[PDB]
From Swiss-Prot, chain A:
It comes from Mus musculus (Mouse). The gene is B2m. It is found in: Secreted. It comes from the Eukaryota. Keywords: Disulfide bond, Immunity, Immunoglobulin domain, MHC I, Secreted, Signal. The chain holds residues 21 to 119 of 119 of the full protein. Disulfide bonds join C25-C80. Residues 5-94 form the Ig-like C1-type domain. The keyword Secreted applies. This is Beta-2-microglobulin. Heterodimer of an alpha chain and a beta chain. Beta-2-microglobulin is the beta-chain of major histocompatibility complex class I molecules. Forms a heterotrimer with MR1 and a metabolite antigen. Belongs to the beta-2-microglobulin family.
Curated annotation (Swiss-Prot), chain B:
Heterodimer with B2M (beta-2-microglobulin). Interacts with MHC II and CD74. Disulfide bonds join C98-C162, C202-C257. This is Antigen-presenting glycoprotein CD1d1. Keywords: Cell membrane, Disulfide bond, Endosome, Glycoprotein, Immunity, Immunoglobulin domain, Innate immunity, Lysosome, Membrane, Signal, Transmembrane, Transmembrane helix. Glycans are attached at N1, N14, N36, N104, N159. During protein synthesis and maturation, CD1 family members bind endogenous lipids that are replaced by lipid or glycolipid antigens when the proteins are internalized and pass through endosomes, before trafficking back to the cell surface. It comes from the Eukaryota. The gene is Cd1d1. The keyword Glycoprotein applies. One of its GO terms (cellular component) is endosome membrane.
Length: 99, 273
């Protein structure tokens, strides 16, 4: 009926300061299929963020991959904010210089 | 040896706001899309028309264009007959498709989830309420089960059309389903809770197909204890996976990552130094 989205932030290539990359945010296990994904660079939203098409697993929960083009910087933070019915308030997981 | 699935998602928030989008997969590569706003199914691959002649593909797509406007309209009649659980915000999913076996036949399926719980199926020649499915759904399926045309048309799509279509694809798609994409790897360590024991992390990304071996090594010594996580996707339809190992300071020296994957042969051994 209602399930809180599990969130996961990770890069596409090994991040390296200054080198272009792609930041992936994989939201999952939620239900209903009505959630607003927002990708943030230091508090600001990134304008153009691509999202895949929403589909569901055989356990019927939904999933999606919002993602964008990013560059790792010693002074820059990135994060994925999720708004879902089943969350009293928005969940923001930030990204670690590892994933 | 592939699984063709076509997941449809209908959302009914109220009498005047419904949305049904769909998305098809051949294994783990998406081949099609049908956004509620688009009047025709969009291919998401060069070869998503299979070996279908336009005239026949076009005649097939018409079916769905008709089914849609209809399933959608009939849900509204359905919903009025929704006691006792009168609860308009209805989310319904439909997973249909067919697992393609070589020697064996293919296996077809049609599952329907109501409010995220699985409640009905199409079986052989008639639609049937699966256990746990609420009491009311019984009168609707019994009156639905009288539609010989639909249930004939279904037994066709289900039984006959689906495999016909799918082989075509394994044939034209052969190119991208057989692509051997090479992975990249990098390590990183994260300290644990309050204590001098951190955990080494091995990230491997950009590989395809899915099957990959990752594991921490100490020489020829395999580390029991390495814990492989979830396969996370990438926008290019490749995979991500990372294997961690909780160590203890001092003896992190000599440990390393051995990434075994089909596209390689002579594989990534990333020593931690």
């Amino acid at each position: 009926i209602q399930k809180t989205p599990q969130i996961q932030v990770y890069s596409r290539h090994p991040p390296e300061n200054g080198k272009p990359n792609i930041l992936n945010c994989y939201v999952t296990q939620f239900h209903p299929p009505h959630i607003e994904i927002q990708m943030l660079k230091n508090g600001k939203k990134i304008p153009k963020v691509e999202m895949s098409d929403m589909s569901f697993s055989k356990d019927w929960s939904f999933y999606i991959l919002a993602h964008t083009e990013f560059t790792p910087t010693e002074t820059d933070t990135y994060a994925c904010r999720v708004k879902h019915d089943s969350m009293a308030e928005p969940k923001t997981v930030y990204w670690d210089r590892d994933m | 040896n592939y699984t063709f699935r076509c997941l449809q998602m209908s959302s009914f928030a109220n009498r005047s706001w419904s949305r049904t989008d769909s998305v098809v997969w051949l294994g783990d590569l998406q081949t099609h899309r049908w956004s509620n706003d688009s009047a025709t199914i969009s291919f998401t691959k060069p070869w998503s028309q299979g070996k279908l002649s336009n005239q026949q593909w076009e005649k097939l797509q018409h079916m769905f264009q008709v089914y849609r406007v209809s399933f959608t309209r009939d849900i509204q009649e359905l919903v009025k007959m929704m006691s006792p659980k009168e609860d308009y915000p209805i989310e319904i999913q439909l997973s249909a498709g067919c697992e393609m076996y070589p020697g064996n036949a293919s296996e077809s399926f049609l599952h329907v989830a109501f409010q995220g719980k699985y409640v009905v199926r199409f079986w052989g020649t008639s639609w049937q309420t699966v256990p746990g499915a609420p009491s009311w759904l019984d009168l609707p399926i019994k009156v639905l089960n009288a539609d010989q045309g639909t249930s004939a048309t279904v037994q066709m799509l289900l039984n006959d059309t689906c495999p016909l279509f799918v082989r075509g694809l394994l044939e034209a798609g052969k190119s991208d389903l057989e692509k051997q994409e090479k992975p990249v790897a990098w390590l990183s360590s994260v300290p644990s809770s309050a204590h001098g024991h951190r955990q080494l992390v091995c990230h491997v990304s950009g590989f395809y197909p899915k099957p990959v071996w990752v594991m921490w090594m100490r020489g020829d010594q395999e580390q029991q204890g390495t814990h492989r996580g979830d396969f996370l996707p990438n926008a290019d339809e490749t995979w991500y996976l990372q294997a961690t190992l909780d160590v203890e300071a001092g003896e992190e020296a000599g440990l390393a990552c051995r990434v075994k994957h089909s596209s390689l042969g002579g594989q990534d051994i990333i020593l931690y130094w």
